[PDB]
């Protein structure tokens, strides 16, 4: 209640504090957001499928509500996300006869979408995840396969950044990805961003999703990743932080509540993480959780459909967890 510290105040001098929302959860969690965050991200309603579900049909209504909420409460907004292998409708890659479109056609659709979306929120949204998760998560290759990449070629990302920059040259443009602290994938992300910067491409930041577990990645791997990326001269945002109660191999569905030890280790893990972020306050400018309280989290159904997870600083009744007290006292 009254005597609880406010996350954004606690970290006033370190970084912004954000949360991913939709219009429902804005209503359901309004007070937590008003009390703690100074930054908002749309969990789903600014991805391609929720902005242009059919060609020439733009559905900005839900995204507008999110932006209106943020502006009415002095909160910044991160835009998420323009170009991604997921949650993009099929029409984008097809012609009238069901076949794939050409390089030049896909570029015009990319440019048209990026221009329409970014111009609408120009001067309200201060940064954009332009490219999401383009690096390969496994294997020897640099890049994931995607229809973006297959149709256009490997320079589809340079084009995306240049289209966004032209639509709003005052925005900070980000490459955004997960498993960003595993060394092999860290070096791919580093190598990709380095090459883009070395060509003069307007990429200003790296977004570290940080969909983490109690164990992985280690504090040393997080520190190395921060330093490797920060050495490129880019801004760093932590963009989707949560601390899952299950490791990747742990696919149990029948846990009705977190254990005493899970709750305690999570508190400790969050304390170590925010200590590391504070230490690197000079390169980390924002820390956004993918949610805010345990009554809404995508981890309830990912990677295991139909279970429950407890990944955030507040519980389902919106009360501070022990993780809260450790996080604010670094």
Ligand X SMILES: O[C@@H]1[C@@H](O)[C@H](O[C@@H]2CO[C@@H](O[C@@H]3CO[C@@H](O[C@@H]4CO[C@H](F)[C@H](O)[C@H]4O)[C@H](O)[C@H]3O)[C@H](O)[C@H]2O)OC[C@H]1O
Rounded to an integer, what is the distance from CA 194 to the centroid of its chain? 21
Residue 86 or 195 with smaller CB distance to ligand X: 86
Residue 4 or 219 with smaller CB distance to ligand X: 219
Q: Is 178 in the site for ligand X (CB under 6 A)?
A: yes
* 24-28: Cβ within 8 A, 24+ apart: 25/291, 25/296, 26/65, 26/66, 26/69, 28/295, 28/296
Residue 205 or 240 with smaller CB distance to ligand X: 240
Residue 74 or 305 with smaller CB distance to ligand X: 305
Nearest Cα to Cα of residue 208 among 228, 237, 234: 237
Phi-psi sector, 282: left (phi>0), alpha (psi -120 to 50), beta? alpha
CB of 161 closer than 8 Å to CB of 173: yes
What minimum distance in Å lies between the beta carbon of 282 and ligand X? 25
Q: By CB under 6 A, name the one of 95, 108, 145, 248 that touches ligand X.
A: 248
Q: Is 182 in the site for ligand X (CB under 6 A)?
A: no
Look at the block and give the residue holding tokens 């992300």: 189
Q: Is 100 in the site for ligand X (CB under 6 A)?
A: no
Q: Residues 37-66 vs ligand X: string with x where CB under 6 A?
A: ------xx----------------------
Q: Is 205 in the site for ligand X (CB under 6 A)?
A: no
Count of positions (residues) in the chain: 330
Residue 83 or 101 with smaller CB distance to ligand X: 83
Residue 38 or 132 with smaller CB distance to ligand X: 132
Q: Residues 254-293 vs ligand X: string with x where CB under 6 A?
A: ----------------------------------------
> What's the rounded Cα separation, in Å, for the pair 118 and 262?
42
Count of Cβ atoms closer than 10 Å to residue 165 Cβ = 20
Q: Which residue is nearest to ligand X (CB)?
A: 298
Q: By CB under 6 A, name the one of 179, 286, 288, 309 that touches ligand X.
A: 179
What minimum distance in Å lies between the beta carbon of 114 and ligand X? 17
- Restricted to residues 289-318, the positions that interact with ligand X (CB under 6 A) are 298
Q: By CB under 6 A, name the one of 18, 79, 205, 240 that touches ligand X.
A: 240
Residue 265 or 278 with smaller CB distance to ligand X: 265
What minimum distance in Å lies between the beta carbon of 248 and ligand X? 4
Q: Is 209 in the site for ligand X (CB under 6 A)?
A: yes
Residue 44 or 116 with smaller CB distance to ligand X: 44
Q: By CB under 6 A, name the one of 8, 78, 211, 269 that touches ligand X.
A: 211
- Restricted to residues 147-166, the positions that interact with ligand X (CB under 6 A) are none
Phi-psi sector, 251: left (phi>0), alpha (psi -120 to 50), beta? alpha
Nearest Cα to Cα of residue 215 among 246, 240, 242, 237: 246
Residue 21 or 106 with smaller CB distance to ligand X: 21
Number of chain residues interacting with ligand X (CB under 6 A) = 11
CB of 224 closer than 8 Å to CB of 181: yes
Binding footprint of ligand X on the chain (CB under 6 A): 43-44, 86, 132, 178-179, 209, 211, 240, 248, 298
């Amino acid at each position: 209640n009254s005597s609880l510290p406010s996350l954004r105040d606690v970290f006033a001098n370190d970084f912004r504090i954000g949360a991913a929302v939709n219009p429902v959860t804005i209503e359901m969690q309004k007070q937590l957001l008003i009390d703690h965050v100074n930054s908002i991200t749309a969990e789903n309603h600014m991805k391609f499928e929720h902005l242009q579900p059919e060609e020439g049909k733009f559905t900005f209504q839900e995204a507008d509500r999110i932006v209106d909420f943020a502006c009415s409460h002095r909160m910044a907004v991160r835009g998420h996300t323009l170009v991604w292998h997921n949650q993009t409708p099929d029409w984008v890659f097809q012609d009238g006869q069901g076949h794939f479109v050409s390089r030049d056609v896909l570029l015009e659709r990319m440019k048209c979408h990026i221009s329409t979306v970014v111009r609408r929120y120009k001067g309200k949204i201060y940064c954009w995840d332009v490219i999401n998760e383009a690096v390969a998560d496994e294997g020897n290759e640099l890049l994931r396969p995607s229809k973006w990449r297959q149709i256009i070629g490997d320079d589809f990302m340079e084009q995306a950044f240049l289209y966004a920059y032209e639509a709003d040259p005052d925005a900070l443009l980000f490459y955004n990805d997960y498993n960003e602290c595993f060394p092999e994938k860290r070096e791919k992300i580093f190598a990709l961003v380095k090459s883009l910067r070395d060509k003069g491409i307007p990429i200003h930041g790296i977004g570290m999703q940080a969909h983490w577990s109690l164990t992985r990645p280690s504090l040393d791997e997080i520190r190395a990743a921060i330093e490797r990326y920060a050495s490129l001269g880019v801004v760093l945002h932590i963009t989707g932080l949560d601390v899952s109660m299950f490791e990747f191999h742990d696919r149990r569905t029948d846990l009705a509540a977190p254990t005493s030890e899970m709750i305690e280790r999570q508190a400790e893990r969050y304390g170590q993480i925010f200590a590391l972020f504070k230490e690197y306050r000079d390169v980390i400018q924002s820390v956004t959780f993918w949610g805010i309280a345990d009554d809404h989290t995508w981890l309830d159904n990912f990677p295991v459909h139909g279970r429950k997870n407890w990944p955030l600083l507040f519980d389902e009744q919106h009360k501070p967890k022990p993780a809260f007290w450790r996080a604010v006292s670094v």
